[PDB]
Amino acid sequence: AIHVKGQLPNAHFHKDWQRYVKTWFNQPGRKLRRRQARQTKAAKIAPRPVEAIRPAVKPPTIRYNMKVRAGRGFTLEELKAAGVSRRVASTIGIPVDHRRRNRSEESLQRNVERIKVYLAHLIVFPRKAGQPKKGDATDVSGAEQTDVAAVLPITQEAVEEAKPITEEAKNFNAFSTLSNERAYARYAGARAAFQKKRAEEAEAKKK
């Protein structure tokens, strides 16, 4: 029974847990298998990059919206503005995300720049060898499998190292502004319901 010092025990071992114990003795084996699959895939799709180029997007929620990460695929607007048809995008390793949209010019411009850099570094082989066509390249001899992250890395946003302190900043009251702004949002509804009572119940005064 309980008589020792420490936390009251919590162990969730009342089912037949030994029946479903998962061990990891295959962890180095799985690691070797996965590396061999990557090597097999790389040799098969060569000289195409092993990884497709991805957009840069901002993660949701206030915990991560200060960061930048790879997204699933480029938006239809982003492909349009970079001069790439959506049916052609997949044929040259550009993923298409029909779900994501560009709510701001910054997201659009950032990813349009990624596509433009990709296209400028891209060597499209002609469909028929030795008969170059529009949109292709005529110097395919120096083609090799290269990492997209070596050419188009995901870059985090930089900072202002230093700047002058203006008189406007010196007069700014940060704490009071935070308290006022929170109070203003908090009592917006009461203010709106008050405004109805301020201008509607007074209408009987006319007649």
Partner: protein
């Protein structure tokens, strides 16, 4: 849009832009062909028995009773108010 994390128009200020039309959001619109088909079907099929009962209460100016019956028949009040307005238009369409 102060650029703070509190207040009415909180959040970082970026360059806003117009999102393109998503055709999936067109759902719920009434196409002219579908409206024509439904008018024909309403001619062939009549009214459901509860619809006749609701219209009768509407024609006798028992507005609360019609609302109680339509909500009781359809479930929610929101569907009832839409149905009573539709049946009210029918009643006035005949007048």
């Amino acid at each position: 849009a102060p650029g703070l994390v509190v207040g009415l128009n909180k959040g970082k200020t970026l360059t806003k832009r117009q999102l393109p039309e998503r055709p999936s959001r067109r759902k719920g619109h009434l196409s002219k062909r579908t409206a024509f088909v439904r008018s024909i079907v309403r001619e062939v099929a009549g009214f459901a028995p509860y619809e006749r009962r609701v219209m009768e209460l509407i024609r006798n100016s028992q507005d609360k009773r019609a609302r109680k019956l339509a909500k009781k028949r359809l479930g929610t009040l929101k569907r009832a108010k839409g149905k009573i307005e539709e049946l009210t238009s029918v009643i006035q369409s005949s007048r």
